[PDB]
Design a protein around this ligand. Structure first.
Ligand SMILES: CCCCC/C=C\C/C=C\CCCCCCCC(=O)O
Ligand SMILES: [K+]
Ligand SMILES: [K+]
Ligand code: NA
Ligand code: NA
Lengths: 579, 558
């Protein structure tokens, strides 16, 4: 397979690859990576739909894990996929079209990103406030990824850096903890460089009409069903037995339980197996208005399956680094709070400066309470987020970056709180008078459901050589790993739906010999215009000569500025507002 | 309107723009820019086809150029055009699959000495003259207004293989626009690895009319687009109201009769200003093409517009006082049997008769006095060719020099004489040349095109009108003499399509991005790669060293 960019390869359709009529696919896991794998097999490999088998764990607001993340314009592979998927909401258009038009009619932005002091906007909200710490980000970008394997974010950055607005925005919007992968943080800084101008106000974000299941999954299900793709339910895959001959690796048998019955699927080299290794949602537990979600570190089918594959070959990854020994401080709890009436509306509208009731964007993404002990953030998407909402209901999402600290108002770790308690802590930080908080958080007014997710932070655990298996392991004849614990050969970023679609595309194009380019990760880190733009924005719009940096670097900059005067390079710096 | 890049904007379909149902379009000129205007109007503006009027000068030449992968706008258009040759597929798909099955490359780019490959063929051979190219890219465009190529480069630069390759493949003459040469060097930086062997180039299956024009005509006719024939537009009368400019009347002769079309601000006029093919003449095997500098309908129309507003450009800059040395003559030689085939096959090392690429682009005879180049596309180039016919294209960069064998300037030569000069340079024994170039064996037809080099004349700000002039309510200029706001390069079909897209999206308020010029000049990987290939692959041209290597490896540069 090969990588490409530009419209010629984007718009081109591949020829049907040789041999595909003889082949079948077994997709283990029906999350976005698996569904996307089926799409590329149907559309591009031209595999017969009835030869594609999606093995699904499940059988044939308040729901917190039907929920998803924002996207951005440069999700190159994901948009390649969704332009071919009919919209369910807009008949006659693609899903891309629905989303593009929605984004044009109701563009995303935040009027208030950071609050403190029980409801005041942080006075420096909007500013990165990096000062000389910006140099640290530059130094990270200039440090090769192979030099920083296993290292954490806090091992690299200064104490000062973690006190900056930049770190607040970054850690909260991406869910980076200080003990997470430095290499992944570097990948994010490179990957999303083109959006440095749009991070504090979230103008860089785009969102679906509805919750992820409704908006992103249902159109895929409809498309796959329409092409005769086979869905197997109540499937619990215990293992994929892999044969070794020479340097070749061949999936030989799928071992599973389905409808309570032990089954095996015998495979040949023409049966292609795609494994979603690992899960960030598995083992989630649920509380309710009056009950905490039970704390657990149980492993389910996904983690066990990866363990069983890992035992068979050193190239099949190391699940333990992602699912074992996560710190107590990790993000675990997310909650949805349903406002049942309009009593609390003014406490949110005073922040967003927008009506909650007009169907358009509200918070524009998370608001973070910077002096909350939990590092509590909340967001209100455009509404309704669930089509089942009555017209008076508004659904608020609530999350805590720190799980080991007692709250400011409710003196408990978030992991020990009922839904009502989580709501009470929020209301406290919104400025609701304390005498009203108990009533305003009670069921007549709000219903709040917490979920404890042991592995929600797992994608970002520091990685060493071999921890993630290659999408197509060397010598693999008919076996791929897909999803956000697989190792794409690119520098793409995990905890994104783009990465799921990418691994699907790379797996299918590689194993089925699809003769069309896979888009490279969008090359903004190599675009001089974006490098210069980022240095302008990151410094809170200082000219390059005025930016705080160690004196030898400052001297180097002055010398260089003299070297390029009156040249095209100077025009590029002027265009970037750096001179 | 706005510029974009990436797949999100590429794949997105625009909403139907407000007010389009009350609007019509008048497209003056049916070259590629005009047809492309109509495609964007139908597909993206959703203007009714019956409200789109293409005014065609002809009642009722065929040859075009290569393309490359980063023709972003042109591929945006052709992915929506059904292929005529491969039913069920887009034209882009036809072309993409063909390019994969029969990829283009040249095994012989430069020849001399009556049929030897030049010994340094394949090398740029720039040496320190490479610095001059760097200097040019580092010179702001605003500093080189009106300058010519020969005003900037050293005598030594013009002796380099680089200049031979560049001048002949792009038809840059020494007195042409330096700014445009700079734009070509920046625009096509991503293909520096592929210029001497033409692996950068892609070609249609057939001649430009058959391959590029016919599918457009089918698409537009299928959508109800109106074609008006034998239209000779003499003027577009433009009113001025405050700062606004509004096309008010089209004045034209159609079918022997004078007519006027009255316009409102909802009738959108797209003018292809100027033409490189206008006033072309044809000779035959035994007759030179008649020589001329006549201005025709297109030049006269641009002049009549230029008179009405200083924002409407200055055609005289491009169409007057072209040097006698300019390229004027192209010829097609049809081989009627296989008697001459070895003289081409010895060069290409490929059979002429297997339907696959042959010369891969022009071969230039570096020691010919005319600077004669010739190409043999994949065959047949015309569907009407009999199986034993092979069509060869021939051009001369210099029109003011006597040939080496035929002692005449190309502009004074019959088809047969142009063939004889070619066969001389292929190493055919001179005693055999007259018979082998005779009609039983070769039939050669010369064309004289007075304006073929006009796109590249040195220009200043304002000489090309903006695609949508400031304050224009319903008038656009399209094609390769209009000024796109980008750094894009003329003498390309890509530029035609770009101006069409810019004009339509601007005047009709289409809310979708127009792809920016592909940004390879800003991609540091390409800056580094270009330095490597331009120097003929030179390296030459501690802990930190190791991190630099690791970074380069991380970016696949090593
Ligand atoms: C999001 C931040 C992006 C800002 C731009 C990033 C990088 C700019 C490009 C490289 C800077 C060139 C100087 C390299 C510094 C080397 C210092 C060192 O020897 O360690
Ligand atoms: K709103
Ligand atoms: K051939
Ligand atoms: Na930016
Ligand atoms: Na296509």
């Amino acid at each position: 397979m090969y990588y490409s960019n530009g419209n010629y390869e984007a718009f081109a359709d591949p020829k049907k690859p040789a041999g595909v009529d003889k082949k079948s696919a077994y997709i283990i896991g029906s999350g976005l990576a698996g569904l996307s794998t089926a799409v590329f097999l149907v559309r591009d490999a031209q595999m017969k739909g009835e030869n594609i088998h999606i093995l699904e764990e499940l059988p044939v607001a308040g729901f917190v894990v039907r929920g998803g993340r924002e996207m951005e314009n440069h999700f190159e592979c994901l948009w390649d996929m969704y332009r071919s998927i009919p919209s369910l909401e807009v008949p006659g258009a693609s899903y891309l079209d629905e989303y593009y038009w929605l984004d044009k009619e109701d563009p995303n932005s935040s009027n208030c990103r950071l609050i403190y002091n029980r409801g005041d906007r942080l006075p420096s909200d909007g500013q990165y406030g990096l000062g000389k710490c910006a140099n640290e980000i530059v130094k990270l970008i200039m440090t090769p990824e192979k030099e920083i394997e296993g290292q954490t974010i806090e091992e690299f950055f200064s104490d000062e850096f973690f006190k900056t607005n930049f770190w607040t925005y970054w850690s909260t919007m991406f869910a980076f903890e200080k003990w997470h992968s430095l290499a992944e943080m570097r990948r994010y800084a490179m990957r999303f460089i083109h959006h440095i101008d749009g991070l504090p106000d979230f103008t860089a974000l785009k969102f679906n009409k509805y919750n992820q299941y409704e908006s992103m999954v249902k159109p895929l299900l409809a498309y796959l069903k329409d092409h005769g793709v086979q869905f197997e339910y109540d499937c619990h895959v215990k293992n994929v037995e892999v044969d070794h001959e020479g340097d070749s690796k061949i999936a030989k048998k799928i071992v599973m339980t389905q409808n309570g019955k032990d089954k095996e699927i015998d495979l040949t080299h023409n049966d292609i197996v795609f494994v979603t290794n690992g899960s960030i949602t598995e083992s989630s537990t649920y509380g309710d208005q009056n009950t905490p979600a039970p704390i657990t570190n149980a492993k389910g089918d996904s983690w066990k399956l990866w363990e069983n594959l890992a035992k068979q070959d050193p190239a099949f990854g190391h699940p333990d680094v992602f699912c074992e020994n996560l710190p107590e401080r990790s993000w675990f709890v997310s909650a949805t709070a349903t406002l049942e009436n309009k009593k609390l509306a003014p406490y949110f509208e005073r922040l967003t400066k927008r009506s909650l009731y007009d169907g358009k964007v509200n918070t524009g993404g998370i608001i973070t309470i910077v002096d909350s002990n939990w590092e509590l953030s909340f967001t209100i998407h455009r509404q309704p987020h669930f089509k089942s909402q009555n017209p008076d209901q508004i659904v608020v999402w609530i999350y805590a970056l720190y799980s080991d600290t007692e709250g400011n108002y409710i003196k408990k770790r978030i992991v020990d709180c009922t839904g009502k308690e989580i709501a009470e802590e929020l209301l406290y930080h919104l400025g609701v008078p304390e005498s009203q908080i108990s009533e305003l958080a009670s069921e007549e007014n709000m219903n709040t459901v917490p979920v404890y997710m042991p592995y929600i932070t797992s994608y970002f655990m520091p990685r060493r050589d071999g921890d993630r298996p290659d999408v197509v392991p060397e010598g693999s004849i008919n076996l791929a790993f897909i999803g956000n614990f697989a190792e794409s050969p690119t520098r793409d970023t995990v905890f994104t739906t783009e990465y799921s679609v990418r691994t699907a595309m790379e797996a299918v194009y590689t194993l089925l010999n699809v003769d069309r380019g896979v888009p490279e990760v969008f090359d903004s880190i190599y675009d001089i215009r974006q490098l210069l733009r980022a240095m302008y924005y990151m410094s809170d719009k200082k000219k390059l000569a005025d930016q705080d940096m160690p004196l030898p670097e400052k001297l180097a900059v002055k010398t260089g500025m003299r070297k390029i005067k009156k040249t095209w390079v100077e025009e590029l710096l002027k265009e970037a507002n750096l001179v």
